Structures are given as C-alpha cells and as structure tokens.
Design an enzyme around this catalytic site. Structure first.
Site, mmCIF file in Angstrom:
data_model
loop_
_atom_site.group_PDB
_atom_site.id
_atom_site.type_symbol
_atom_site.label_atom_id
_atom_site.label_comp_id
_atom_site.label_asym_id
_atom_site.label_seq_id
_atom_site.Cartn_x
_atom_site.Cartn_y
_atom_site.Cartn_z
ATOM 1 N N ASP A 142 0.738 -1.243 -0.079
ATOM 2 C CA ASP A 142 0.123 -0.052 0.099
ATOM 3 C C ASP A 142 0.750 1.224 -0.213
ATOM 4 O O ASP A 142 1.488 1.534 1.220
ATOM 5 C CB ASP A 142 -0.813 0.071 1.215
ATOM 6 C CG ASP A 142 -2.074 1.211 1.144
ATOM 7 O OD1 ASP A 142 -1.884 2.003 0.434
ATOM 8 O OD2 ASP A 142 -2.754 1.062 2.122
ATOM 9 N N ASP A 153 -4.414 6.768 -3.291
ATOM 10 C CA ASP A 153 -4.156 5.962 -2.132
ATOM 11 C C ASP A 153 -4.860 4.507 -2.932
ATOM 12 O O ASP A 153 -5.951 4.340 -3.234
ATOM 13 C CB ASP A 153 -5.269 6.125 -1.029
ATOM 14 C CG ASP A 153 -4.877 5.430 0.073
ATOM 15 O OD1 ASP A 153 -5.603 5.344 1.182
ATOM 16 O OD2 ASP A 153 -4.062 4.527 -0.094
ATOM 17 N N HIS A 222 -12.345 6.021 2.648
ATOM 18 C CA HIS A 222 -12.563 7.367 3.154
ATOM 19 C C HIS A 222 -12.262 8.436 2.146
ATOM 20 O O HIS A 222 -11.878 7.921 0.937
ATOM 21 C CB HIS A 222 -11.277 7.380 4.142
ATOM 22 C CG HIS A 222 -10.116 7.088 3.399
ATOM 23 N ND1 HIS A 222 -9.197 8.156 2.627
ATOM 24 C CD2 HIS A 222 -9.406 5.729 3.523
ATOM 25 C CE1 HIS A 222 -8.028 7.537 2.373
ATOM 26 N NE2 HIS A 222 -8.433 6.062 2.674
ATOM 27 N N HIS A 230 -7.210 11.457 4.667
ATOM 28 C CA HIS A 230 -8.602 11.180 5.388
ATOM 29 C C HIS A 230 -9.293 12.683 5.527
ATOM 30 O O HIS A 230 -8.980 13.425 6.403
ATOM 31 C CB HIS A 230 -8.480 10.626 6.680
ATOM 32 C CG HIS A 230 -8.453 9.069 6.477
ATOM 33 N ND1 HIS A 230 -7.752 8.444 5.854
ATOM 34 C CD2 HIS A 230 -9.294 8.323 7.305
ATOM 35 C CE1 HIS A 230 -7.910 7.125 6.010
ATOM 36 N NE2 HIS A 230 -8.771 6.805 6.496
ATOM 37 N N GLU A 255 -11.335 0.990 -0.160
ATOM 38 C CA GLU A 255 -10.298 0.062 0.492
ATOM 39 C C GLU A 255 -11.156 -0.999 1.221
ATOM 40 O O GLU A 255 -11.928 -0.644 2.235
ATOM 41 C CB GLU A 255 -9.225 0.584 0.979
ATOM 42 C CG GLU A 255 -9.375 0.950 2.279
ATOM 43 C CD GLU A 255 -8.166 1.662 2.992
ATOM 44 O OE1 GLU A 255 -8.207 3.166 3.183
ATOM 45 O OE2 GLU A 255 -6.979 1.138 3.311
ATOM 46 N N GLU A 350 -7.365 -1.763 -2.952
ATOM 47 C CA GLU A 350 -7.684 -0.228 -2.624
ATOM 48 C C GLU A 350 -7.522 0.267 -4.163
ATOM 49 O O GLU A 350 -6.530 0.349 -4.666
ATOM 50 C CB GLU A 350 -7.032 0.126 -1.884
ATOM 51 C CG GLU A 350 -7.154 1.758 -1.187
ATOM 52 C CD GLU A 350 -6.425 2.145 -0.215
ATOM 53 O OE1 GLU A 350 -7.022 3.326 0.423
ATOM 54 O OE2 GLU A 350 -5.387 1.798 0.273
HETATM 55 C C1 LIG Z 1 -1.409 5.691 8.581
HETATM 56 C C2 LIG Z 1 -1.750 6.691 7.457
HETATM 57 C C3 LIG Z 1 -1.550 8.182 8.081
HETATM 58 S S1 LIG Z 1 -0.555 6.307 6.189
HETATM 59 C C4 LIG Z 1 -1.522 5.971 4.645
HETATM 60 C C5 LIG Z 1 -2.154 4.434 4.857
HETATM 61 C C6 LIG Z 1 -3.236 4.347 3.796
HETATM 62 N N1 LIG Z 1 -2.392 3.769 2.713
HETATM 63 C C7 LIG Z 1 -4.490 3.563 4.480
HETATM 64 O O1 LIG Z 1 -5.064 2.878 3.128
HETATM 65 C C8 LIG Z 1 -5.270 4.206 5.323
HETATM 66 O O2 LIG Z 1 -6.191 4.791 4.950
HETATM 67 N N2 LIG Z 1 -4.723 4.098 6.600
HETATM 68 N N3 LIG Z 1 -5.793 4.821 7.652
HETATM 69 C C9 LIG Z 1 -5.612 6.286 7.828
HETATM 70 O O3 LIG Z 1 -4.892 7.001 6.923
HETATM 71 C C10 LIG Z 1 -6.414 6.996 8.945
HETATM 72 C C11 LIG Z 1 -7.122 6.277 9.864
HETATM 73 C C12 LIG Z 1 -8.091 7.047 10.798
HETATM 74 C C13 LIG Z 1 -7.888 8.458 10.908
HETATM 75 C C14 LIG Z 1 -7.117 9.102 10.034
HETATM 76 CL CL1 LIG Z 1 -6.817 10.824 9.936
HETATM 77 C C15 LIG Z 1 -6.384 8.215 9.062
HETATM 78 MN MN LIG Z 2 -6.732 4.362 2.405
HETATM 79 MN MN LIG Z 3 -3.692 2.794 1.386
#
Ligand SMILES: CC(C)SCC[C@@H](N)[C@H](O)C(=O)NNC(=O)c1cccc(Cl)c1
Ligand SMILES: [Mn+2]
Ligand SMILES: [Mn+2]
Length: 369
Positions: A142, A153, A222, A230, A255, A350
């Site tokens: 990812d 994403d 999201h 997000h 996703e 995703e």
């Molecule tokens: C841990 C993320 C900041 S790094 C990006 C990870 C994404 N590839 C993944 O698909 C995803 O959406 N993870 N979850 C979040 O980014 C997340 C969950 C709850 C609140 C917020 Cl602000 C972000």
């Molecule tokens: Mn995501």
């Molecule tokens: Mn992701």
C-alpha cells in the site's frame, strides 16, 4: 518518448502535453427515480463543472500513472528472500523518480505499507528491521503518490503460495463491488453492506482449514482531501455505518480488508507511521530538538504522512524523544501497525475514485487490478 525497462523516466516527461491518461470512466449506478447518470456524462452544465476542474483531475491522473508504472515494476521483482527494507527502498526509489519528487508539489503521499500476514496495514520497517519476506507470507503493498496534494491511495496484495488465491479474489471482488456501488447521492452505509455481502460469499481453505472471509470491521475506505489522506467521511465495509451520502466532486479511497481471523484489528508492534494533525495550527516551541523536528516535518511533509526511515534519510538522528513530544502534544499522531489475531491471514485491495460531474472515474485502475 517511451520509458526504460527499470522505470526511470518521470511520467511528466512521457506526456509533454501536460495531459495524462484518464482512469476507468463509469456511468453512475441507477437510483430509483430517474436519477441515473446516462444524463450526467451528457449534460452541458455538468460537462462545464467537470471541465472546470480538469487541472485537478489531471494532477490525480499524473499521480495514478506513476502509481501504475511503479506497482507493475514492483510486481516483477518482489520475491521472498528480500528484506522488507530492501523492498520499500527499491519501490520508493522508483516512485520518487516517476513522480518527479518536488518538495510538497510532487512526491510520496505516504509511507510504503508492506504489512504481513495477520497484520493488515500501517507497517513499514524502521531502521534495523531484519524482517525477511517469506514464501508463505501474504504481503499488502500500500503506497501513495501525489501531485499538488492530489493523492492516489491505492493498494494490492502479494503472495507466492497459491493457497491464498481465493482469499485475494474475495477481497478484490469486494473492493470492485464497493467501487461499482459508489456514486453521487449513494448512502455510505449501503456501500458497506454491499461490500460485506460479496466478501462473505467467499469461503476459502488454507492448510486444511476452511473459513468464510470476514471483512475487517474497524478498517474502512475514506474520502480524500488536498494534502489530507482522510477528509472526514468513512466508507465502512460491513453494514450499519451511517447513511451519510457521497457528494459530487468528492474523491474516495475505496479499500476493503478480508481476514481469516476475528475481523478486527488492534495496534501491535513498533510504530513507524506518523502524520501531523490536520486541524492543529501553528504551535510555538522552544524545546530545541522538538522545535527543529517539527520544522523538518512542516518543510518536508506538511500534513502528509511520513515514517521514521524518511526522517533518517533526511539526516535526522536521535529524534525519537522529540517525535514522542510532538505526539504527546497532539501536534503529530502515531499510526501503529494494525493486526488481527496471531495466525490469521489478511488481504487488501484499494483504489482511488473521483466523483466527477459527468461520471465516476476509477483513476487508479490498471490492467493489473
Ligand atoms: C497511517 C496513515 C496516516 S498512512 C496512509 C495509509 C493508507 N495507505 C491507508 O489505506 C489508510 O487509509 N490508513 N488509515 C488512515 O490513514 C487513517 C485512519 C483514521 C484516521 C485518519 Cl486521519 C487516518
Ligand atoms: Mn486508504
Ligand atoms: Mn492505502
């Protein structure tokens, strides 16, 4: 002109016209009152509203094409025996190249997730991690790219043992179902119900044990915002998850996650992922090390997610306490690995979609998935 075998030519130079390929364009799903979409891709005022944001759609497309070329590349060489660090370094080296990294104007949207087996997301190795990919590992790749904060994403699952095939098919089908159900005025709780129905229609057998694939209930899709992975709305993945509607002009990360465990994730292992709170404003800091780190973060990442490895490459050292301070101050938020029960297997797929005026565009769609 064309690109080299090992991807090295920026996507920008492959299209001197500044016009990048669109992703899969779909007509919005029918409603129940003549509120379909066979009129949207046709309307004059809609074509106007849509064309008005052409530059924005274009930035997403440039990021998506970089994403497609990088993952195709990754799929050709990722093999058990390689350390997780070697995998992420090689992937990121190529991503920076094709996206033509330019500070906050173009670059990696977030760390390279390569979560293994029972762990579904938010794992990327920190310095010194000796983990080696195994033949029986189920790895979720990812990673993201962005152009002017327009984030892609997108993720897929890597395996080498055919025993996980049906499990991957189940999650892939679930994600595609979520993508098809999505649209303007669609209730988010309905997309989740749809995703779960497809996901659970799959039963799999692994090492003599059978399972009905379970969606990971506390994980979800999201909406996406500029420089904001997000934006605020969540796309469930199960059932009763808010009847809020998707709106025109919104961008979403559809996703889904499937698991043979409990279908619930919890924080586990050492944290590697971090991201500044989008709602936290300027905060004066006198503490020397904490002050410097925050400045480094604002200059290099802004509100985009980052990892420890990315601090190391910038020449930072002995920043752990300073990083903990920022977290404790609520300026930065930690995002530890999310894993299901020990012994369980999780898979993910995703895509990023654009809810354009004339249609729905699965901008990150490829010939692979
Ligand atoms: C841990 C993320 C900041 S790094 C990006 C990870 C994404 N590839 C993944 O698909 C995803 O959406 N993870 N979850 C979040 O980014 C997340 C969950 C709850 C609140 C917020 Cl602000 C972000
Ligand atoms: Mn995501
Ligand atoms: Mn992701």
């Amino acid at each position: 002109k064309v690109q080299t075998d090992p991807p090295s030519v920026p996507i920008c130079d492959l299209y001197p016209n500044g016009v990048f390929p669109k992703g899969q364009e779909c007509e919005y799903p029918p409603t129940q009152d003549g509120r379909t979409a066979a009129w949207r891709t046709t309307s004059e005022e809609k074509k106007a509203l849509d064309q008005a944001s052409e530059e924005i759609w274009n930035d997403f497309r440039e990021a998506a094409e970089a994403h497609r070329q990088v993952r195709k590349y990754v799929m050709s060489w990722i093999k058990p025996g390689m350390t997780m660090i070697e995998i992420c370094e090689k992937l990121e080296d190529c991503s920076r190249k094709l996206i033509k990294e330019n500070g906050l104007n173009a670059g990696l949207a977030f760390p390279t997730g390569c979560s293994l087996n029972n762990c579904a997301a938010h794992y990327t190795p920190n310095a010194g991690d000796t983990t080696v990919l195994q033949y029986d590992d189920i790895c979720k790749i990812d990673f993201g790219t962005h152009i002017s904060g327009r984030i892609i994403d997108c993720a897929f699952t890597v395996t080498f043992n055919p025993k996980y095939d049906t499990l991957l098919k189940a999650v892939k089908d679930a994600t595609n179902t979520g993508i098809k159900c999505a649209g303007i005025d669609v209730r988010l709780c309905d997309v989740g119900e749809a995703i779960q129905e497809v996901m659970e229609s799959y039963e799999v057998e692994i090492d003599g044990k059978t399972y009905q694939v379970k969606p990971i209930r506390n994980l979800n899709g999201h909406s996406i915002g500029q420089y904001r992975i997000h934006a605020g709305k969540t796309v469930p993945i199960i059932k009763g998850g808010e009847a809020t509607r998707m709106e025109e002009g919104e961008v979403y990360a559809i996703e889904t996650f499937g698991s043979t465990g409990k279908g619930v994730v919890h924080d586990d292992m050492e944290c590697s992922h971090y991201m500044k709170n989008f709602d936290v404003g300027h905060v004066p800091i006198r503490l020397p090390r904490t002050k410097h780190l925050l400045n480094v973060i604002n200059e290099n990442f802004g509100t985009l997610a980052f990892c420890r490895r990315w601090l190391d490459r910038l020449g930072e050292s002995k920043y752990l306490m300073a990083l903990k301070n920022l977290c404790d101050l609520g300026i930065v938020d930690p995002y530890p690995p999310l894993c299901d029960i020990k012994g369980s297997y999780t898979a993910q797929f995703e895509h990023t979609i654009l809810l354009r005026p004339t249609c729905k565009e699965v901008v990150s769609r490829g010939d692979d998935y």
